[PDB]
Amino acid sequence: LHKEPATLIKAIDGETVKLMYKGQPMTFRLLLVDTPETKHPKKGVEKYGPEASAFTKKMVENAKKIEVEFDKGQRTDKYGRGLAYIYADGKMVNEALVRQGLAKVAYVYKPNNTHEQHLRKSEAQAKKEKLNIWS
């Protein structure tokens, strides 16, 4: 896998960010993470939806360097969103959320699953500690 630089344009929610990637604004959906939603023509504002959005927003906004890391399968989903692992100053946003109990490991579509084991290890650790989603 290889990380490439990108520039923050705008944070959308817990699992979606808008980035400038190779001179193009794109919507990126965080691989292997499912956060409670703020906006969703599907049941509204789940508990933690707001906390999850806040966490991603602060993390990518206070970063001096943003990197996108594609997995080894398809890099876009059917809605044209890039599918990647995003790093804010060397730290993976996807893992940070799972570790804090603000997301659950979801949507595993092979072969876009390189870090699934690493994230599931983080999820168990957060459940163990009864954090947010798991409290």
Ligand X SMILES: Cc1cn([C@H]2C[C@H](OP(=O)(O)O)[C@@H](COP(=O)(O)O)O2)c(=O)[nH]c1=O
Residue number with CB closer to ligand X (100 or 112) = 112
Decide the pairing of beta strands 25-30 and 82-88.
parallel
Told to check if 83 binds ligand X by CB under 6 A, we report yes
> Is position 120 annotated as part of the catalytic site?
no
54-62, 75-83, 86-94, 114-122 -> range binding ligand X (CB under 6 A): 75-83
Q: Select the span of 2-10, 57-65, 86-94, 107-115 touching ligand X (CB under 6 A).
A: 107-115
The residue from 46, 69, 75, 81 that is catalytic is 81
Interaction of residue 29 with ligand X, rule CB under 6 A: yes
Report d(CA 103, CA 22) in Å as an integer. Answer: 29
Is 29 a known active-site residue? yes
- Give the nearer residue to ligand X in terms of CB position, either 69 or 77: 77
Residue 97 φ then ψ, to 5°: -60, -45
With 0-12 / 13-18 / 19 or more C-beta atoms within 10 angstroms meaning exposed / middle / buried, residue 54 is: middle
Q: How far is the CB of 130 from ligand X (least distance, A)?
A: 24
Per-residue 3-state assignment (H helix, E strand, C coil) for 18-78: EEECCCCEEEEEECCEECCCCCCCCCCCCCCHHHHHHHHHHHHHCCCCEEEEECCCCCECC
Residues of this chain that bind ligand X (CB under 6 A): 15, 29, 31, 34, 77-78, 83, 107, 109, 112
Please identify every residue annotated as catalytic.
Answer: 29, 37, 81
